[PDB]
Structures are given as C-alpha cells and as structure tokens.
Design a protein around this ligand. Structure first.
Ligand SMILES: CCCCCCCCCCC(=O)OC[C@H](COP(=O)(O)OC[C@H](O)COP(=O)(O)OC[C@@H](COC(=O)CC)OC(=O)CCC)OC(=O)CCCCCCCC
Ligand SMILES: CCCCCCCCCCC(=O)OC[C@H](COP(=O)(O)OC[C@H](O)COP(=O)(O)OC[C@@H](COC(=O)CC)OC(=O)CCC)OC(=O)CCCCCCCC
Ligand SMILES: CCCCCCCCCCCCCCCCCC(=O)OC[C@H](COP(=O)(O)OCCN)OC(=O)CCCCCCCCCCCCC
Ligand code: HEM
Ligand code: HEM
Ligand code: HEM
Ligand code: HEM
Ligand SMILES: COc1c(O)c(C)c(C/C=C(/C)CC/C=C(\C)CC/C=C(\C)CC/C=C(\C)CC/C=C(\C)CCC=C(C)C)c(O)c1OC
Ligand SMILES: COc1c(O)c(C)c(C/C=C(/C)CC/C=C(\C)CC/C=C(\C)CC/C=C(\C)CC/C=C(\C)CCC=C(C)C)c(O)c1OC
Ligand SMILES: CCCCCCCCCCCCCCC(=O)OCCCOP(=O)(O)OC[C@@H](O)COP(=O)(O)OCCCOC(C)=O
Ligand SMILES: CCCCCCCCCCCCCCCCCC(=O)O[C@H](COC(=O)CCCCCC)COP(=O)(O)OCCN
Ligand code: FES
Lengths: 93, 54, 385, 123, 248, 126, 93, 55, 50
C-alpha cells in the first residue's frame, strides 16, 4: 500500500523526539540484585506520603454528598411517621 | 445548453434521480397489476363472486 | 495528500477497492470472488430476519418454518432466497476453485492464500449441513443419523464422541437445539477467514491468464473493474430471482416436507446435490474406518498440489496435454455426484470405484508425470544439437 | 432404562416402545418359544449363533430395530413362520429372528437387560 | 429397481395454473372444497389451514362463519375450574375426524391416512400424481400379483399395493353451479384445492416476480453499455517501439 | 520446480541419440505450434516464471538491449489478449528467432547455488 | 509499525518491473469515439474463431464420460427386467 | 529478519503485543482495557454454551 | 422424585412415595386414555387442576 498521513510517533530507530547529546545511563542485572528489597519501607513510609498528598481532594466532596444524603433520608423517615402527617399534607400539593 | 442544467451538478441529478424513482414505483405497479389481472380474467375471485349473485 | 489516503479508516478502503493496481488482461473468471462476498451478505441478512420467528425445539421446529411461509409478511421470499441462495453460493465456489486450478494460482508465491481457501471450504460444508438439520424434515433426521454414526468407527474414542455430539442416545431434542446455535456462529468465523484471505492477496496481488509478470501494465480498480464487477452482479440476481419466484423447489427434495419420524425410514436417503460427489467416495470403500478417512482425504489432497506440479510455466494456457486432462477431472466430478444419487446396484458400484481412483490419481500421478514431459518437449523443439 | 411392567403386554402382541429413543421390539412369551426357534441347522447362514448365547432369560424377549442397512423397520403380525419382514431390500426375520435370505449380513443386538425380580430393566 | 417397485410414471396434463403468468382457477377451488367436505374429510385431516384464509379466495365472509359454527372447540374452564366448549370462529383451524393416531389406525386396518395440507409438495409428480392416483384404480389386478388381505392395486403407487380403496364414482355430489360431477371432474378440483393449501402465495408470488425480472433485466443491459464506454480508451490504445541507441 | 540442469540432462541424451531423436522431435515441434505463444509475439523464455532468486539473478545480468526488447514483447502481449485478438501473421515470432537467450544465464546461477550448498554442509576428510 | 518482508509487487511509482526505454503509447478519449462499434463483427466472426480453437479439449472428454454413463444405465435397465432375471442372479453373488 | 516480522499474520501480533513502544511511566490504571477484552471473551463463550439449551 | 434419593430418603423409600399417585399414560390400542402409577422421573404433583 501507500504511506498514510504522518503522526506524532514513529518506531524503534526513529521515534520523533528531540536529539539527545550528553546523557549517560547505567543499570545492573536483576539476577545480580537481592530479591524484592522494595516492598517494605514502601508500604508504610512511602504509602503514607502518597495518601497525605491527595486525600483532601476526595474526602471534602465525599463529605458534602454523604451529608446531603442523610438529611434527605431522615426527613423522609419523618414525613411518613405519625408525628409528620400534617407536614406531609402541605408539601405534596 | 441541455447539459449545463440536466446533470451539471449532481445535486441537480441525485435529487432528480431520487425524486424520479418515487414516481416510477407507483406508475410501474399500476401498469403491471392491470396487465396481470386482464391476462387472467375469468379465473379470479371477483369474477366468480359476480356469477353467483342470484 | 487526499483525505482518503491520510485517514486511518478510509486508507484501507482506498488501498483495496479504489487505487489497488490490477493487471489489465484479467477476464471475467476473476469476478467470482466478489460474488462470493455478496452471497455471504445475502445469507447472513436473510437468516437474522428468519431467526426472529424461529423455534428450535424438536416438537416446534418443522411447524415454525411453515409459520414463516404462511403468516410472516414476505416470509416465503426470505426462505426461498435463503434455500436457493446456498445452492448458488456453492456453484460459484466450484468455479472459483477450478479457475485457480487452471491458471496456476496455487503456486508460489500464493501458497498461503490457497491454504486459507481450503479452510473456508471446510467451514462452508459444515454450515450448510447444520442448517439443513434445523428444518427437521424426513431427510434432516436421517441425514444426521448416518453422518454422526460415522464417528463411531474411530478406535477407542468412537462411541464417546457420538453420544457427546447427540447429547443423548439418538438424534433428539438436544441435537436440534445445539445445531441451530452452532449454525449461527460459524458464518461469523467464515467472515474472519475472508479477511485473512484478502490480506494474503494484497502482498503479491492477482495473477493473469498469460502466467507472466503484470508489473509492466497496471490500471486502477475504480471505474474499470468496479463497473466490470457490476455486470456479473446483475446477472447473478436475475438468475437467482428466476429460481426464487418461478421455480423455488426444483433444487430440493420432496421428502423434506414430511415431518421427521424416527420409526419410518425413507426408501432413499441422499444429501443435497452439492455433497453428492463426496457421498459417492465414502460409498466406494467397503470398510467403515477407511471410508471416513478417504472422504476427508478428498478435501485435504488439494494441499499437495503446490508440490506435485513440476513445471517451469504457470498455468495451462500454452499446455496441450495438461488442458485435456483438466477437463477429464471436471467431468469425473460430475459423474461422482451423479453416482451418489443412484441406488447401490450393479454396475453403479464398480463405476464409483474407478471414478474415485481417477480423482486421487490426478493430484498424485498424472500432474507430475505430464508436467515433466512438457518441460522436456519445450527444450528439444528449440535447442537443436 | 425403562420398566413398563411384566403382565402388561399379552402373548400375541408387540409394542415398539420409544425406549431410550429407539424402535425396540418387545415380545412376551410362553414356553411356546424353544419349540421351534432352532429347528434349522445353523450353518445355512451368513455366520451363526445359538439360543444360549442369544438370551438365557428366555420368556421375555426384546430386540432392536437399528438395521444394518440404514435403519429399516420390520413387521408386526404376519408371515410364513411368523417373523419380521423387511421391505427395504428383502428379508424376513424368523420366529428366532434370523436370515432366510437377503443381503443383510448379521442380526443386531438383544439389549442387555438383566433380571432381578418384579421388574426387568431394558438397557 | 424393478419398475413395479418404483411405480408408474404420472403423465403430464395441461393445468391452467401452469405457466409463469397464470393464476389459480378460483371456481375450481370452491368446487374442490365441496369434494373435501363430503368425501375426504371422513378419513383425512387438514390441520394447517385456518378458516380465515378461505375468505376472498373461495367463499365470502358470511359463508365461512356459518361453516365454522357447525363444530365444537375447547374454551377456557369456568369460574370453578370445569371444562367448557364453544362454537368455532375464523381464527380457528379446520378440525380433523380422529382424536389421536391410535384411533385413526383402528378404523383403517392398521394404515394411517396422512395430513393433506402439504401432499402436493411432498410427492414427486405434484398435481399430476395426485390426479392419476385417484383415476388409476383398475377393476381387476393384472394376472399373477397376489394381494395381501385388505389392500388394492394401483400401479402409480410404489409397490402396487395401497391401503386406500377407490372413493370416486360418478354423481356422488351435486354442485351448486351445475357442473357435471363425473370422476375426472371431481379429481381435477380436489387437486386444485389441495395445491392452494400447499401454496397460498402462488398468485402474488408470480406477480412480484414479473416486476423483479423486468427491473433486473434492464439494469443488466444498461451495465453492459456503461462498461464498454468507460473501457474504450484501453481497448484502442496503441504501442510502438524504437530501440534505444547503445550508449547507456 | 524441476531444475533446468535436469531438463537439459534428459534432453541432450535424446538429441544425441539417433533412434530417439526421430520419434520425439517431430512430436515436440507440433507441441510448440499448437501452444500458440508465437502468435501473441512471445518467445518461450518470456513465459518462464520469475518469482524466485535464481531467475531474479539471471535477469539482472541480462544485457540491456535484450532487456528493453523483452519488456515491449510482454506489454504488447497483455494488450493483444485484452482485446481477444491475435496479431498479424507478419508480426509472429518465427522459428529462427525462438532462441534460448536466457538459458545460459540460468545454468550458471544454478551451478553456483549447488556448489555453495555442498560446501555449507560438507564433512571433513581427516 | 515496522517494515515487513519484501515482495514481488510494489505501488504506483515503484512497481518492481524492469526499466523501460523506447516505448511510446497513444490513446483517444471515449467521448470522442463512436458508441460501442465493437459488439458486431465480434459476436459472429471473432466468437467463432475462439470456439474453433478450444472446443476439442472439452468435447472429447465429455463424449467419453457420457457414453460410459448411458451404457451403465441401459445395462441396469436390463438386469431388473423379466428378460434379465437370470443374469442378475449370477453377478450379485 | 525474524519470522515474526516478515510473516503477514505474525507481523500484526508483533506490532501490537510484543514490540509495541510504550511509555515507561504508565501506572495500573492503564490495565483496564486488557480486562475489558477478557470480559468480552468470557461473555461470548458462556453465552454460546447456554444457547444450546435455551428456548 | 429422583432428586430426593441420596439427600433425604433412600431409593426404596422414594419409589413407595411416588407409587401412591396417578399419572397420565399414553392411550390404549383403540385410542382411549390410560392412567398409571408414579415413577422416579415424574414430578411431584399438586392438589389443584387449574
Ligand atoms: C450465476 C452467476 C452467473 C455468472 C457466472 C459465469 C460468469 C463467468 C464466466 C466466464 C465467461 O465470461 O465466459 C467466457 C468463457 C471463456 O472466455 P474468455 O474468458 O476468454 O472471455 C471472457 C470475456 O471477457 C467475455 O467478455 P467480452 O470482453 O468478450 O465482452 C463483454 C460482454 C459482456 O458479457 C458478459 O456480461 C459476460 C458475463 O459483452 C456481451 O456479452 C454483450 C451481450 C451481447 O467462455 C464461455 O463462454 C463459457 C461460459 C461459462 C460456462 C461455464 C459455467 C457453466 C456451469
Ligand atoms: C470489582 C471488579 C474489580 C476487579 C479489577 C480490580 C483492579 C482494580 C485496579 C484499579 C486501579 O487501577 O488502581 C490502581 C492503583 C495503583 O496505582 P499505582 O500504579 O500508582 O500503584 C503502584 C504500586 O505502588 C506498586 O505496587 P507493585 O507493582 O510493587 O505490586 C502490585 C501489587 C500490590 O503489591 C503490594 O503488595 C502493595 C504495593 O498488586 C497490585 O497493586 C494490583 C493493582 C491494584 O490502586 C491503588 O492502590 C490506589 C487507588 C485505589 C483505587 C480504589 C478505587 C477503585 C474502586
Ligand atoms: C474439490 C473441488 C473441485 C472443483 C471442481 C468443480 C468442477 C465444476 C466447475 C465448473 C466450472 C469449470 C469451468 C472451467 C473454469 C476454469 C477456467 C477456464 O477454463 O477458462 C479458460 C478456458 C480457456 O478458453 P479461453 O478461450 O477463455 O482462453 C483463455 C485461457 N486459455 O475458457 C473456458 O472456460 C473453456 C470454455 C468453457 C468450458 C465449459 C465446459 C463445461 C465446464 C463444466 C461446467 C459444469 C458441468 C457442465
Ligand atoms: C454461509 C451462510 C449460510 C448458509 C450456507 C446457510 C445454509 C442453510 C441451508 C442450506 C438451510 C436449509 C434450507 C432449506 O432447505 O430450508 C438453512 C436453514 C436455516 N438457516 Fe441458514 N445458512 C447460512 C446462514 C444463516 C444464518 C447466519 C442464520 C441465522 C442468523 C441462518 C438461519 C437459518 C434458519 C433459521 C434456517 C431454517 C429455516 C429454513 O429452513 O430456511 N442461516 N441454512
Ligand atoms: C467465501 C469464500 C471466498 C471469498 C469471498 C473469496 C474471495 C476472493 C477474492 C475477492 C479474490 C480476488 C479476486 C479473484 O481472484 O476472483 C480471491 C482470489 C483467490 N481465491 Fe478466493 N475467495 C473465497 C474462497 C476461496 C476458496 C474456497 C479458494 C480455494 C480453495 C480460494 C482461492 C483463491 C485464490 C488462489 C485466489 C487468487 C487467484 C488469482 O489471483 O489468480 N478462495 N478470492
Ligand atoms: C373416506 C375416503 C378415504 C379414505 C377411507 C382414505 C384412506 C386412505 C388410507 C388408508 C391411506 C394410506 C395408504 C397407504 O398407506 O397405503 C390413504 C392415503 C392417501 N390418500 Fe386417502 N382416503 C380417502 C379419501 C381420499 C381422497 C378423496 C383423496 C384425494 C383427494 C385422498 C388422498 C390420499 C393420498 C394422496 C394418500 C397418500 C398416497 C401416497 O402416499 O402415495 N384420500 N388414504
Ligand atoms: C457483551 C456480551 C454480553 C452481555 C453484556 C450479556 C448480558 C446478559 C445479561 C445481563 C443477561 C441476564 C442475566 C440474568 O440475570 O440472568 C443475559 C442473559 C442471557 N444471555 Fe447474555 N450477554 C452477552 C453475550 C451473550 C451471548 C453472545 C450470548 C449467546 C447466545 C448470550 C446468551 C444469553 C442467554 C441465553 C441468556 C439467558 C440465560 C440467562 O439468564 O443467563 N449472551 N445476558
Ligand atoms: C482483487 O480486488 C478486490 C476486489 O475486487 C474486491 C471486490 C475486494 C472486496 C471483496 C469482498 C468479498 C468484501 C468482503 C465482504 C465480507 C468479508 C462480508 C462480511 C460482512 C457481512 C456479511 C455483513 C454482516 C451484516 C450485519 C452484521 C448486519 C445484518 C443485520 C441487520 C441489518 C439487522 C439489523 C436489525 C434491525 C432490527 C434492523 C477486495 O478486497 C479486493 O482486493 C483488493
Ligand atoms: C496498548 O497496548 C495493547 C494492549 O495492552 C493490548 C492488551 C492489546 C490487545 C487488546 C485486546 C482487548 C484484544 C482484542 C480482543 C477481542 C477483539 C475479543 C474478540 C473475542 C471473540 C471474537 C470471541 C471468540 C469466541 C468464540 C469463537 C467462542 C468459541 C465457542 C465454541 C468453540 C463453542 C462451540 C459450541 C457452539 C454452540 C458454537 C492491544 O491491541 C494493544 O495495542 C497495542
Ligand atoms: C491482536 C492483533 C490484532 C489487533 C488489531 C489489528 C488491527 C487490524 C488492522 C490494522 C492494521 C491496518 C494497516 C494495514 C495492515 O498492515 O494491516 C492490514 C489490515 C487488515 O486489512 P483487511 O481489513 O483484511 O482488508 C480487507 C478489506 O476488504 C477491507 O476490510 P473490510 O472487508 O471492510 O472488512 C469489514 C468486513 C467485516 O469486518 C468485520 C465485521 O470485522
Ligand atoms: C481482523 C481478523 C484478524 C486478522 C488476523 C490478525 C490476527 C492473527 C491471526 C493469528 C496468527 C496465527 C497465524 C499463523 C502463523 C503462521 C502462518 C504461516 O506459516 O504462513 C504460511 C503458511 O500458513 C498456512 O499454511 C495457512 C495459515 C493458517 C492460518 C491459521 C488460522 C507460510 O508462508 P511464508 O510466510 O513462510 O512464505 C511462503 C513460504 N512457502
Ligand atoms: S433391511 Fe433387513 S434385510 Fe433388507
């Protein structure tokens, strides 16, 4: 077939990024490393840092929507009781 | 001339093709049903129903 | 560039049916593969609309097909277009395969395309068999009886795979309910083998009736071979409409309008017309196990053809002897189908034993011997030592 | 594996019950069976078999109809001996149930029905 | 096999519904239902035909309602749970004479009469075989054949021995319109009525087939012209060769 | 896929035999005239299939004067069959011109590929 | 993706044939040609030439297989007649 | 080249599930799309085996 | 009835419980209806007909 429209990604040898000069990388084999020394000092010390950074953006919305749900229940509980029969008659019509 | 309006666009001609096909079906059906019923007249039910009305 | 070349989805359509390079000299025998794509669309669409009214229970199946033919609006059009559509699907495939066998389309570099085709042919015989049983007529009960009982001859695993196919101890209600569900699936597996089939054609393209290279003279697909394919589409519909509206029960059997009865056997139990050549090959061997092997071997012997052709020329256009023997094989295939619709009587037993030897001898003896002779005949006619 | 009863099929009858999905040939008896079932020399046959090999619970008889042509069905209540009649190609399974002539190579199967008292299980 | 085991070949008569532009004769269908009700229906069922399908084909709506009302059907049980019966209506199906297959064989010496709603399509020969069967009983079998007790000779039946006996004799019905009711005449009507029971779409199938074939035959001829026009440049193309000079 | 080395091995035994070359050569001359490639304007070596490495090698090494003339014969042939006609009787290939122009280039490509395989899977004398 | 294995066919601009030099082509528009002058003098004079070239490779095989079918029928017709009852009894067993 | 890169059918598998270039920093939220492909295979298989007994 | 064997009752116990009911058999040689006792393949019957 023919070539198609060009993209923002290529393949191995020509990936389309900028040219690199002056960066050096080092590594070691897995067979030469001690087994999984990365589970602990990571499930307590690091996992707590990750929790403390982001828990405020979830729990303030959750607190708003759960408080709104309970006040709706308790009011519906009350309207269909014997004490809340007179208020049920008004807010319907 | 004729070609500059008959089919110059094809909004001239896909609308004329489609609008002209709707009129074709009706005119085509009435002509076939009239030939079919006249080729077999005397055998249909409406002819039998008109011979027992005593 | 144009938008049809730069878009991810239109680029595939453009590369296959618009701008695809084609040889200029291909004839109308190259139009059968587009028809087989229309046949599959007809068969699938008409089946969805009948499946809304069908019931697969063995006490309801036969009367549900009559409910389609009497009560459903335009239901007799759906069925007859379906029953006659399958006979037209198999006739175009026999012509497609005989084409490739004549012009040498199986040879290198198109061996992979020929092997995926043999798989499609197996799945289409299976599909047609399973649906003929969903009618549950008299030929539909007793055809499933004698075919499923052939797997009883396999040693040490025979009586277990038959009770597993049936779901019990005979062709019964579990058998008909599972055959319908298998029958809806396999058409969608065929559609995926067709995609793989076209992908293997795109890397080398099509051949031509001269059997030489086509890279020197190419024309595009759009408005030359789109409008040449349109000629055979309207002839196909015209001949099919003549059978559906004026002669809709001439290619079937009358006994399938009798409901299935396990206690009463018919006087002659035969398949549809397109499985008769293979029914006569099975009937030729006087042994249960060897007849089942030979019946299946008659389909897989197509795979040794790329290896037994010993010619340096592709195709039969310029070959005198290999053209005479191509047509002996064609009319031997018609006599096999015709023997399979006869009684087991003298002399139809010996006639079917000689004609099934000529079927296997063509692929394994005749082709490699005359192809070697024709090579040497071309050499000495020119070179004068 | 079914059990209708044992005093439910009188003498000169038979019922092709749909037992397990088959035309199987029930036959209630009298000692009026070893009378005449083997008054013929065995070796005038395809390749033979004897009463004691056939069934040794001998006063209730059952036999299949799954014929070795393509599944043909024999008679009820006629013939010269009183046997079972193939119109398919040609045969008459005599009172014991065997060849007189025909292209039929062998007799089928007497379903492996075992006796324990008060009911005979067919199958 | 032997010719007696296959049966005699039914000849080819000239039916007025044969041909691609011909319909049924609807006065023979009406005339043919009268022969079913008075001869055949004692021992044959028509279970796949509803009363409502006869309106506009052979009888008026008021005629058909009076024919269905002369039978009893099963209604839904009353307020305590006991069974009820009711008369017939248009949505009901034509009833048969026997309650079960055991009773049908008990009245015909072991033979079962088949349902006739599809007998024209389920036999090789079609209308030519049903007609020849009924008019084909000879008054004495040929010399040599030994019939079993309770069977009759008909050479159109495979084998030559059929459990049915002759049932058509001259002037056993009197037609309303006044046609002479001979043996051949009554046979021509039942075979025309029974083909309608198998093929109710026969008349409008062959009308929609005339439209389809005329439209597709015109599209097939227009396709040839368009293709030849668009291929005219390739067919008349010319080529010429001049050998290059040997210096490249 | 019979090799050309083998075809000539058999053919040269027939031609150098007195009694064999008088029963099979007349038969082979009628076989070529009934085939009909000379009426489309083709020589036999144009019909050989070329989707393999031994034939791709022979065509690279063919001189260009003979290569340009081959491409014109093939284009002229596709066009003659497209129209369902034959060429004029004075444009047919004659028997003098029906020469094996490509055979010698093929036989030397085959003798070299066989020599390589015999050396790639040899066992040593020691 | 990456390139795949090379083939014996390319695309427009690079089709993989030999190099051409010295061939010239001419053509005329379809609009400028007379309508379809190619149907007659082609359905009689040419169609007969095509028939005569190839009909012998089809009809000699067809004649062999049809003659073999009729002699098989007529012999089967005869065995199940009254005159062919004695020969039927031998060739069975 | 390797056979998985030259064959018409394995080339697609190689380009999609073997040699496809991926960013190194993607997390476990990028694993939900492979699960949805397993879900569809579970449903189509179980439903076909039940359809043999359904009315 | 058969689903109770090996769960709550023995096989001999269950056969005697099913035999105390009447079910519809297939008709006789003339076509009249028949009744029969119960067996293990039968389903537990209910008190009301409709
Ligand atoms: C149900 C589906 C229906 C379609 C299936 C058949 C279609 C494929 C058959 C191939 C064929 O076309 O037959 C030609 C065959 C071998 O010959 P060939 O390949 O060298 O030449 C081809 C050239 O392009 C014709 O076409 P041509 O270039 O000569 O002119 C165009 C032609 C258009 O006709 C058609 O539509 C043909 C489908 O113009 C007209 O006919 C105008 C009408 C007056 O010689 C024959 O005539 C043999 C006939 C076929 C017999 C085998 C099948 C029987 C079971
Ligand atoms: C009901 C049907 C569900 C069935 C499918 C279940 C799959 C749901 C997965 C949802 C998800 O994608 O959340 C991902 C998020 C982790 O984001 P991350 O890449 O930064 O953590 C990498 C990790 O540190 C390295 O962990 P590592 O690679 O070392 O081992 C992974 C292992 C856990 O290893 C441990 O022992 C503890 C470290 O297994 C797994 O973690 C399995 C994956 C859940 O998960 C988290 O831990 C935090 C987000 C909580 C999500 C809750 C809301 C969803 C309802
Ligand atoms: C396991 C599967 C096995 C499949 C085998 C199925 C066999 C039945 C298939 C029926 C179709 C077979 C027809 C042959 C098609 C192959 C292509 C072909 O034969 O066309 C080339 C042939 C040569 O004549 P041309 O003038 O067209 O020259 C062009 C190249 N030489 O041009 C021709 O077409 C020759 C002229 C027409 C011959 C018609 C004879 C009847 C063919 C059999 C039809 C079916 C039985 C009647
Ligand atoms: C390759 C596609 C197909 C082939 C070759 C095929 C073949 C057949 C055949 C030969 C019959 C018997 C025709 C007869 O004598 O009545 C049949 C029946 C049937 N098929 Fe198909 N079929 C295909 C696709 C389908 C599909 C996809 C469906 C469901 C969606 C379907 C639904 C049915 C039904 C409901 C019947 C029974 C009704 C009838 O007898 O027409 N078919 N099929
Ligand atoms: C549903 C079934 C099939 C479909 C939709 C189909 C489709 C196609 C199409 C569109 C073509 C290209 C155009 C043509 O050559 O006519 C083709 C070519 C081909 N097909 Fe099929 N095909 C099917 C079955 C088969 C079968 C059963 C075989 C062989 C057993 C087969 C072998 C071939 C071959 C060898 C070619 C190449 C011919 C050439 O280029 O000369 N196909 N197919
Ligand atoms: C009260 C009158 C009739 C009685 C007692 C009767 C009885 C029977 C019997 C016992 C059979 C079974 C034949 C066999 O198994 O050998 C039979 C078959 C048949 N009957 Fe009648 N019949 C009667 C009227 C008719 C009429 C008037 C017709 C035609 C319109 C007819 C059409 C047929 C046909 C077509 C068969 C099947 C023949 C075949 O399968 O080849 N019956 N009938
Ligand atoms: C995306 C795939 C599918 C989805 C999401 C899906 C969903 C469902 C759901 C929600 C039900 C009702 C479950 C219940 O409460 O019982 C159902 C029922 C059913 N589905 Fe599927 N389905 C899928 C594929 C299929 C397929 C391919 C079949 C093939 C026949 C099938 C066959 C059935 C059957 C027979 C039932 C009724 C039996 C039952 O209730 O489980 N399903 N489906
Ligand atoms: C040689 O040159 C060619 C060439 O000439 C051609 C023609 C093609 C194309 C050839 C084909 C055969 C096309 C392939 C066609 C298929 C694989 C068919 C598969 C698709 C279907 C069968 C359609 C399936 C239909 C549905 C899923 C919907 C049907 C159901 C409906 C509409 C009911 C919907 C419900 C309601 C309630 C309306 C080539 O690829 C090609 O190569 C370059
Ligand atoms: C980002 O990196 C990724 C990546 O991580 C992944 C996972 C994939 C692959 C992802 C997928 C989701 C795979 C695609 C999965 C599908 C398309 C599902 C298709 C499923 C089917 C077609 C169902 C097939 C099932 C059958 C045929 C059932 C067989 C049933 C039988 C044999 C029963 C027999 C009885 C009867 C009655 C038929 C990528 O493509 C990819 O991009 C590079
Ligand atoms: C896990 C491995 C696979 C993951 C994802 C693989 C994606 C598949 C294609 C992506 C690559 C496209 C780029 C070109 C290439 O190298 O691949 C060829 C693509 C397949 O081509 P094709 O669809 O057979 O064309 C065949 C052509 O005819 C165009 O196709 P058409 O007939 O329109 O099909 C529609 C019919 C039915 O399709 C359905 C319903 O699926
Ligand atoms: C959208 C639909 C899906 C499209 C396909 C994408 C998914 C890939 C399918 C799964 C991959 C499995 C393919 C098998 C790999 C080997 C193929 C091969 O060896 O090619 C062929 C042989 O294959 C065959 O015989 C037929 C293949 C059967 C296909 C099974 C369904 C070898 O051909 P080769 O490339 O070596 O060159 C010619 C040398 N004689
Ligand atoms: S069927 Fe038993 S012998 Fe012919």
């Amino acid at each position: 077939g023919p070539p198609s429209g060009k993209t923002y990604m290529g393949w191995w040898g020509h990936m389309g990024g900028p040219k690199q000069k002056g960066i050096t990388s080092y590594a070691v084999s897995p067979y030469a490393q001690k087994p999984l020394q990365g589970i602990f000092h990571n499930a307590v010390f690091n996992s707590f840092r990750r929790f403390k950074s982001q828990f405020l953006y979830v729990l303030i919305p959750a607190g708003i929507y759960w408080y709104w749900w309970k006040n709706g229940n308790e009011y519906n509980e009350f309207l269909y009781s014997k004490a809340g029969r007179e208020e049920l008659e008004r807010v319907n019509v | 001339s004729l070609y500059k309006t008959f089919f110059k666009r094809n909004a001239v001609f896909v609308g004329t093709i489609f609008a002209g096909a709707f009129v074709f079906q009706t005119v085509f059906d009435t002509a076939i049903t009239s030939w079919y019923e006249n080729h077999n007249k005397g055998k249909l039910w409406k002819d039998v129903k008109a011979r027992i009305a005593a | 560039m144009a938008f049809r070349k730069s878009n991810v989805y239109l680029s595939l359509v453009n590369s296959y049916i618009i701008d695809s390079p084609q040889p200029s000299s291909i004839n109308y025998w190259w139009n059968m593969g587009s028809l087989l794509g229309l046949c599959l669309v007809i068969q699938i669409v008409t089946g969805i609309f009948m499946a809304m009214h069908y019931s697969s229970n063995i006490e309801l199946a036969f009367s549900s097909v009559e409910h389609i033919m009497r009560d459903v609006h335009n239901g007799y059009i759906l069925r007859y277009l379906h029953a006659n559509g399958a006979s037209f699907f198999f006739m175009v495939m026999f012509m497609h395969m005989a084409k490739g066998l004549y012009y040498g389309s199986y040879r290198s570099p198109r061996v992979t395309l020929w092997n995926v085709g043999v798989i499609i042919f197996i799945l289409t015989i299976a599909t047609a068999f399973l649906g003929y049983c969903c009618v549950y007529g008299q030929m539909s009960h007793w055809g499933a009886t004698v075919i499923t009982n052939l797997f009883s001859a396999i040693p040490f695993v025979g009586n277990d795979i038959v009770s597993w196919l049936w779901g019990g101890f005979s062709v019964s209600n579990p058998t008909i309910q599972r055959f319908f569900a298998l029958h809806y699936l396999v058409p969608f597996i065929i559609a995926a083998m067709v995609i793989m089939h076209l992908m293997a054609l795109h890397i080398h393209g099509s051949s031509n009736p001269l059997g030489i290279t086509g890279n020197l003279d190419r024309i595009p697909m759009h408005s030359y071979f789109i409008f040449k394919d349109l000629v055979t589409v309207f002839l196909f519909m015209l001949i099919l409409a003549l059978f559906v509206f004026y002669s809709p029960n001439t290619l079937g059997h009358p006994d399938n309008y009798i409901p299935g009865n396990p206690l009463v056997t018919p006087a002659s139990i035969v398949p549809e017309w397109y499985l008769l050549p293979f029914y006569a090959i099975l009937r030729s061997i006087p042994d249960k196990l060897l007849g089942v092997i030979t019946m299946f071997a008659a389909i897989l012997v197509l795979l040794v053809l790329p290896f037994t052709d010993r010619s340096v020329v592709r195709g039969n256009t310029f070959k005198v002897l290999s053209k005479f023997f191509f047509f002996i094989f064609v009319f031997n295939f018609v006599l096999l189908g015709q023997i399979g619709a006869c009684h087991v009587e003298v002399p139809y037993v010996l006639m079917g034993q000689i004609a099934t030897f000529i079927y296997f001898a063509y692929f394994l003896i005749i082709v490699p011997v005359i192809s070697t002779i024709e090579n040497v005949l071309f050499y000495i006619g020119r070179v004068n030592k | 594996k079914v059990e209708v009863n044992l005093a439910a099929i009188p003498l000169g009858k038979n019922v092709v019950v749909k037992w397990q999905g088959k035309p199987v040939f029930i036959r209630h008896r009298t000692p009026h069976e070893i009378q005449e079932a083997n008054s013929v020399d065995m070796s005038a046959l395809k390749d033979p078999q004897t009463d004691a090999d056939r069934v040794k619970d001998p006063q209730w008889l059952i036999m299949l109809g799954i014929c070795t042509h393509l599944g043909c069905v024999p008679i009820g209540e006629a013939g010269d001996f009183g046997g079972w009649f193939c119109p398919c190609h040609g045969s008459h399974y005599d009172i014991s149930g065997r060849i007189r002539k025909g292209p039929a190579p062998l007799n089928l199967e007497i379903p492996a029905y075992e006796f324990d008292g008060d009911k005979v299980i067919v199958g | 096999m032997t010719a007696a085991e296959h049966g005699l070949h039914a000849p080819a008569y000239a039916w007025s519904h044969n041909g691609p532009f011909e319909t049924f004769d609807h006065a023979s269908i009406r005339r043919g239902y009268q022969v079913y009700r008075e001869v055949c229906a004692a021992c044959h069922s028509l279970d796949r035909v509803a009363w409502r399908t006869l309106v506009g084909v052979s009888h008026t709506n008021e005629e058909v309602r009076n024919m269905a009302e002369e039978f009893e059907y099963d209604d839904e049980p009353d307020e305590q749970g006991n069974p009820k019966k009711r008369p017939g209506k248009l949505s009901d199906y034509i009833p048969g004479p026997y309650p079960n297959e055991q009773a049908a064989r008990a009245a015909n010496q072991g033979a079962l009469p088949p349902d006739l709603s599809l007998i024209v399509k389920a036999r090789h020969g079609g209308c030519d075989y049903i007609f020849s069967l009924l008019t084909g009983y000879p008054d004495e079998p040929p010399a040599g054949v030994a019939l079993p007790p309770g069977s009759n000779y008909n050479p159109y039946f495979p084998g030559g021995s059929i459990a049915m006996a002759r049932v058509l004799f001259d002037d056993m019905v009197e037609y309303e319109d006044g046609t002479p009711a001979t043996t051949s005449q009554m046979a021509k009507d039942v075979t025309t009525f029974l083909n309608w029971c198998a093929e109710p779409e026969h008349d409008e199938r062959k009308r929609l087939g005339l439209k389809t074939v005329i439209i597709l035959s015109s599209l097939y001829l227009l396709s040839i012209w368009v293709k030849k026009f668009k291929w005219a440049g390739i067919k008349t193309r010319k080529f010429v060769f001049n050998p290059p000079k040997p210096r490249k | 896929p019979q090799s050309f080395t083998s075809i000539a091995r058999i053919g040269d035994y027939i031609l150098k035999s007195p009694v064999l070359s008088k029963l099979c050569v007349p038969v082979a001359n009628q076989f070529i005239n009934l085939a009909g490639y000379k009426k489309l304007g083709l020589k036999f070596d144009d019909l050989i299939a070329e989707e393999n490495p031994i034939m791709q090698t022979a065509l690279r090494r063919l001189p260009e004067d003979e290569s340009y003339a081959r491409a014109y014969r093939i284009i002229r042939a596709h066009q003659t069959e497209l129209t369902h006609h034959l060429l004029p009787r004075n444009e047919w290939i004659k028997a003098q011109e029906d020469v094996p122009y490509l055979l010698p280039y093929i036989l030397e490509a085959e003798a070299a590929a066989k020599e390589k395989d015999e050396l790639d899977n040899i066992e040593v004398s020691k």
